[PDB]
Amino acid sequence: SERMNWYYHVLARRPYLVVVSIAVYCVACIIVALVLNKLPDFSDPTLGFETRGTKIGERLTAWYNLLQETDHHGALFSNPSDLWESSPRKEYSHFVVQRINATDSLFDLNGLLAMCQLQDQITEVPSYRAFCEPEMLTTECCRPWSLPNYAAMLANKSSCFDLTTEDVTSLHTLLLGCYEKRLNIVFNVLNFLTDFSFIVYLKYAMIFIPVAQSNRLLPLFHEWEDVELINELVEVVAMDLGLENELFNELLLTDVWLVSLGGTFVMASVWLYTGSAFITLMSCVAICFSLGLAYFFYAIVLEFEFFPYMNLLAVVVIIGIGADDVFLFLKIWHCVLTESLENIMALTMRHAAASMFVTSLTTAGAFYASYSSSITAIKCFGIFAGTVVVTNYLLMITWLPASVSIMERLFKKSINRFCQMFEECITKSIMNYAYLWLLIFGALGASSAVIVFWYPGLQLPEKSHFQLFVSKHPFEVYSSLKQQFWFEKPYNFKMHMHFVWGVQAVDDGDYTNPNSYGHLHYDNNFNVSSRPAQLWILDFCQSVRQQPFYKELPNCFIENLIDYMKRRCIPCCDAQFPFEPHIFEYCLPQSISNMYDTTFFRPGVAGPKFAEAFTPLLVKALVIEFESNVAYSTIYANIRQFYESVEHWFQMQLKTAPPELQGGWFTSDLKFYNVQDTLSHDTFVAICLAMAASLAVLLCFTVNILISIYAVLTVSLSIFNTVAVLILLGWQLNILESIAVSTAIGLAVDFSLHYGIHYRMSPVKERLAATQFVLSRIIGPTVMAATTTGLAGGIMMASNILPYIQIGVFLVVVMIVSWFYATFFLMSLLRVAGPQHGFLEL
Ligand SMILES: CC(C)CCC[C@@H](C)[C@H]1CC[C@H]2[C@@H]3CC=C4C[C@@H](OC(=O)CCC(=O)O)CC[C@]4(C)[C@H]3CC[C@]12C
Ligand SMILES: CC(C)CCC[C@@H](C)[C@H]1CC[C@H]2[C@@H]3CC=C4C[C@@H](OC(=O)CCC(=O)O)CC[C@]4(C)[C@H]3CC[C@]12C
Ligand SMILES: CC(C)CCC[C@@H](C)[C@H]1CC[C@H]2[C@@H]3CC=C4C[C@@H](OC(=O)CCC(=O)O)CC[C@]4(C)[C@H]3CC[C@]12C
Ligand SMILES: CC(C)CCC[C@@H](C)[C@H]1CC[C@H]2[C@@H]3CC=C4C[C@@H](OC(=O)CCC(=O)O)CC[C@]4(C)[C@H]3CC[C@]12C
Ligand SMILES: CC(C)CCC[C@@H](C)[C@H]1CC[C@H]2[C@@H]3CC=C4C[C@@H](OC(=O)CCC(=O)O)CC[C@]4(C)[C@H]3CC[C@]12C
Ligand SMILES: CC(C)CCC[C@@H](C)[C@H]1CC[C@H]2[C@@H]3CC=C4C[C@@H](OC(=O)CCC(=O)O)CC[C@]4(C)[C@H]3CC[C@]12C
Ligand SMILES: CC(C)CCC[C@@H](C)[C@H]1CC[C@H]2[C@@H]3CC=C4C[C@@H](OC(=O)CCC(=O)O)CC[C@]4(C)[C@H]3CC[C@]12C
Ligand SMILES: CC(C)CCC[C@@H](C)[C@H]1CC[C@H]2[C@@H]3CC=C4C[C@@H](OC(=O)CCC(=O)O)CC[C@]4(C)[C@H]3CC[C@]12C
Ligand SMILES: CC(C)CCC[C@@H](C)[C@H]1CC[C@H]2[C@@H]3CC=C4C[C@@H](OC(=O)CCC(=O)O)CC[C@]4(C)[C@H]3CC[C@]12C
Ligand SMILES: *[C@@H]1O[C@H](CO)[C@@H](O[C@@H]2O[C@H](CO)[C@@H](O)[C@H](O)[C@H]2NC(C)=O)[C@H](O)[C@H]1NC(C)=O
Ligand SMILES: *[C@@H]1O[C@H](CO)[C@@H](O)[C@H](O)[C@H]1NC(C)=O
């Protein structure tokens, strides 16, 4: 312990040196990272929710690169000839309206005058005059066509002068007369405006303005948010615009300013606890420098080219965690002052470094275990947050004690009395009433296990939408109110299976960014023209005709080629189905040419693919399409059954094939299903890794076995109760939720670690004295840490984005649950049956 004495002497005797050096280095790294790496573009929020590296992901990447290589460039070419030498539509912007006093049908006069007022309110907005999409060049901003407008249109007069009880009732008699006289397009248009349940009492109406859906009309959206259109009787409840991602970005960038408020509150907490402004200032600086160093190591050093939006969530975490190691430090420091600076620094560092290290290690280990996932955004988030935590810990060790020593170089009643009363009440409660808390929190643990595991588990998302905004946001309300209207159904597109042979199922790209798919490799053992290959391809088609999932051209080209052979002469003419391979390769491109030269020209993925090696071409690949009876569903079990069945049958069929064609693989629109499977598997893996990290850290630092078991129990019950609370709040499995379930461990184990470490650290080995010592020393820092984290999240609750709200719920829930379990369940366990006299000590 001689070298560490020198480090403590440096921190105590020359702190300005460490401060200046850290500041210079971190500011330089920030300068480099922000100047050299161009800034993150969140133009598309659903970027990196794909599972690169898996079987399905490999196949999908290969299939994508194939289409990327079909026609625009590359030796491949589908056709060898290319190788040789007014009424509305959905794209307009539309508002969905409902009536909210009487709450009767919208249709009658009062609703129509309300919609007149709505239209006059919308069109009075200034920017609308620029976006109006004027037509006819008559110096007119064209009017929005809706219910009252059409009611006036059937009449000769204009709108808002309806005289409805004779006029609107005539419009009613018109609609009841006809169903699907067709004056201009009134019936068809108006039956597309209103909902299914119009035949009387349309639950919802819709207003169409002459404005295309674009990314440009965001100030229009904000101007409409100013005047909320709720005037007396009607409510604009779902305004669809092609504006989800732009508003998502803008709201992220505003809600980080809102994160600044939680940062301010955490700084206020540090000021109240410590009693100086210098330490809170330098802790803010430490949080910022940790973020900067992490962004530098992420972008510049590690060359991670993709920065998700989820990485910003790490900021919301670290403002909670970064100040925590402050509260633990100065406490011990003040204790050492009660019982020059070099010795004090040595003692408080020997007492605090274990706990600080342990907390940051558990959090960073969970975050880095998130890198085990196949999804890319999870990998990026894991690496970023782990780097942020590790930077925060190094910043703690170096920059915090120097700031402490500088504070002492620089150098309340109600606060002390309140903290004393709080400590006294908590201590007396735990010591007197222990079995009560043990029973209560064990019951809650069992209930939460039943909730999280058996019946209402973390069910997968089945109507995904990759939701972004709050449920009571118009862009998200509209997605629920789509199906009620007519022009939202295309009936359903059946799924179409592809079988590909020429190319390998490999992803030779960087799995971290979604814009490096790599280069496809062609299988060189691939020979279609062989006679056994012809026989097997024919039997394959005719076998697909047998199987149940089949549903009924370019696909199964071999049939069209046999037809091209069947035609009598007057080379390719007057042949049979089994014929010579050079005749095959010479006549097949001619068959495709004559089939495309037909005026049908069915453009599809199906067919063979040729390359230059008339000149003799060679087939590098083919894809065989078949329409399947299964419809495109979002749920997991249907596509699981479909994919498993078809893959099993195909892999059984391939064994019949020669070794030439034994390189084929299956594909469909299996992106979301692949995500769904990998998400559960990777969540389990990340939970296992983080749990192992926490268990190891426990066994090393709180060397006793019983304390480790009690801590594992407390953490497991805390995570159970948290996940259960989230489920009852309406949480389903998703990327953020898998992340949060993996990181709840490393967030929650901190409190248990503090208590177990200080319990081992007690001089008196009796459980009673050890518990008193533990509580008296460490009750305050845990409280202020949990408070800072929960407060940082609970301000994010006041946001319109779902990620930030979800983090608010998660941080608040985890911190409160973990504190109440570790403080009452674990300490009661130690008070009643804790280890004394070194029982079960390593
Ligand atoms: C930049 C990041 C990696 C954080 C680490 C900070 C280092 C740059 C600090 C930590 C220990 C510091 C050293 C601790 C003490 C000394 C002894 C000192 O020697 C003297 O005796 C001059 C003063 C005198 O004699 O009064 C020269 C600087 C040096 C090596 C300091 C140089 C800078 C060091 C390596
Ligand atoms: C330590 C924690 C609190 C993270 C805070 C990081 C800040 C340095 C970032 C967060 C949001 C950023 C702002 C988000 C967007 C803009 C608009 C930008 O001007 C533009 O018109 C182009 C960008 C756009 O319009 O999206 C000028 C800087 C500014 C205010 C950025 C300034 C720096 C801010 C405050
Ligand atoms: C001050 C210390 C704690 C450093 C903290 C890092 C932040 C200053 C960085 C991290 C990610 C950066 C963002 C990643 C990039 C964007 C998008 C950009 O908006 C645009 O759409 C313009 C670019 C384009 O459209 O081409 C506005 C800045 C912003 C939010 C950057 C603002 C500053 C952020 C929050
Ligand atoms: C430094 C502190 C925070 C402790 C944590 C160390 C991490 C850097 C370790 C812990 C678990 C390690 C992971 C455990 C296993 C895997 C899977 C591996 O991918 C594979 O698919 C091949 C191995 C397999 O069969 O799983 C990639 C590395 C990775 C994530 C390891 C990367 C580094 C991790 C995140
Ligand atoms: C939220 C649920 C899961 C339990 C945790 C909430 C605590 C703030 C409560 C629970 C029981 C409360 C205790 C129940 C009764 C008393 C006796 C009381 O004794 C007195 O000296 C004055 C009043 C009296 O008891 O006569 C001191 C506070 C205390 C231990 C209370 C302190 C705060 C406790 C630990
Ligand atoms: C072991 C089991 C019984 C877990 C017990 C934990 C309780 C403290 C949780 C379980 C369900 C939670 C409730 C679930 C949902 C809500 C609604 C919430 O108000 C809202 O309007 C927002 C809800 C949303 O939008 O999802 C107020 C809190 C409350 C009652 C929560 C309060 C705390 C409750 C009772
Ligand atoms: C202490 C030992 C004896 C274990 C006791 C376990 C009970 C506390 C479990 C068993 C059946 C459970 C219930 C089974 C299922 C439901 C439905 C559930 O309703 C919902 O719709 C919430 C889901 C959502 O909104 O996402 C509310 C919880 C509840 C009654 C569970 C509450 C807790 C119960 C009573
Ligand atoms: C004891 C420690 C762990 C702190 C946790 C206390 C919670 C009960 C507090 C913390 C912040 C509070 C939140 C801060 C502000 C808001 C916004 C409020 O709704 C608004 O949108 C009004 C503000 C706006 O204009 O956006 C709903 C309650 C809520 C989430 C509060 C609910 C309760 C929260 C989560
Ligand atoms: C170990 C035992 C004592 C568990 C107790 C934990 C509570 C402090 C947690 C459980 C559920 C939490 C609540 C879950 C969510 C809500 C709703 C939130 O307001 C919202 O509108 C969010 C809903 C949305 O925007 O979608 C205000 C905070 C609150 C009551 C949270 C406050 C703190 C609660 C009551
Ligand atoms: C696929 O395999 C067949 C036989 O295994 C190859 O056919 C022969 O080689 C040349 C090709 O022009 C010709 O002599 C005959 O067509 C075949 N040889 C015989 C019958 O002895 C065929 O070339 C292979 N495909 C490719 C693209 O090379
Ligand atoms: C105007 O009124 C006449 C007489 O009822 C009717 O035939 C005509 O269709 C009306 N005009 C419009 C645009 O509906």
Short mmCIF file of N, CA and C and ligand atoms in Angstrom, two decimals, residues 444 447-448 451 721 724-725 728-730, ligand 6:
data_model
loop_
_atom_site.label_atom_id
_atom_site.label_comp_id
_atom_site.label_asym_id
_atom_site.label_seq_id
_atom_site.Cartn_x
_atom_site.Cartn_y
_atom_site.Cartn_z
N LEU A 444 -44.86 -9.37 -1.43
CA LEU A 444 -44.83 -8.58 -2.65
C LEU A 444 -43.92 -9.23 -3.70
N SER A 447 -45.89 -12.25 -5.17
CA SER A 447 -46.94 -11.74 -6.04
C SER A 447 -46.38 -11.23 -7.35
N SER A 448 -45.28 -10.48 -7.28
CA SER A 448 -44.69 -9.91 -8.49
C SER A 448 -44.09 -10.99 -9.38
N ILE A 451 -46.90 -12.37 -11.23
CA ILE A 451 -47.35 -11.45 -12.27
C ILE A 451 -46.40 -11.47 -13.46
N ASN A 721 -40.68 -7.04 -8.73
CA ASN A 721 -41.68 -6.03 -8.43
C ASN A 721 -41.65 -4.90 -9.45
N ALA A 724 -43.15 -6.15 -12.70
CA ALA A 724 -44.58 -6.32 -12.50
C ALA A 724 -45.31 -4.99 -12.54
N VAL A 725 -44.77 -3.98 -11.85
CA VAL A 725 -45.35 -2.64 -11.89
C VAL A 725 -45.41 -2.14 -13.33
N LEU A 728 -48.22 -3.95 -15.23
CA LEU A 728 -49.52 -3.41 -14.85
C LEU A 728 -49.71 -2.00 -15.39
N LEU A 729 -48.61 -1.29 -15.66
CA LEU A 729 -48.73 0.01 -16.31
C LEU A 729 -49.01 -0.14 -17.80
N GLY A 730 -48.74 -1.31 -18.37
CA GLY A 730 -49.07 -1.60 -19.76
C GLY A 730 -47.85 -1.76 -20.64
C1 LIG B 6 -47.24 -7.14 -6.28
C2 LIG B 6 -48.23 -6.30 -7.10
C3 LIG B 6 -49.59 -6.26 -6.36
C4 LIG B 6 -47.63 -4.86 -7.43
C5 LIG B 6 -48.06 -3.68 -6.49
C6 LIG B 6 -47.40 -2.30 -6.77
C7 LIG B 6 -48.37 -1.07 -6.66
C8 LIG B 6 -47.75 0.10 -5.83
C9 LIG B 6 -48.79 -0.69 -8.10
C10 LIG B 6 -49.45 -1.84 -8.92
C11 LIG B 6 -50.35 -1.29 -9.96
C12 LIG B 6 -49.95 0.18 -9.75
C13 LIG B 6 -50.96 1.17 -10.35
C14 LIG B 6 -51.15 0.85 -11.85
C15 LIG B 6 -51.59 2.09 -12.48
C16 LIG B 6 -51.95 3.28 -11.95
C17 LIG B 6 -52.60 4.53 -12.63
C18 LIG B 6 -51.92 5.97 -12.52
O1 LIG B 6 -52.59 7.10 -13.16
C19 LIG B 6 -52.58 7.31 -14.56
O2 LIG B 6 -53.55 7.92 -14.96
C20 LIG B 6 -51.48 6.82 -15.61
C21 LIG B 6 -51.61 5.32 -16.03
C22 LIG B 6 -51.23 5.01 -17.59
O3 LIG B 6 -51.36 5.93 -18.42
O4 LIG B 6 -50.84 3.86 -17.87
C23 LIG B 6 -51.83 6.23 -11.04
C24 LIG B 6 -51.08 5.09 -10.30
C25 LIG B 6 -51.57 3.63 -10.53
C26 LIG B 6 -52.99 3.33 -9.85
C27 LIG B 6 -50.49 2.64 -10.08
C28 LIG B 6 -50.28 2.82 -8.59
C29 LIG B 6 -49.45 1.78 -7.91
C30 LIG B 6 -49.88 0.37 -8.22
C31 LIG B 6 -51.22 0.13 -7.30
#
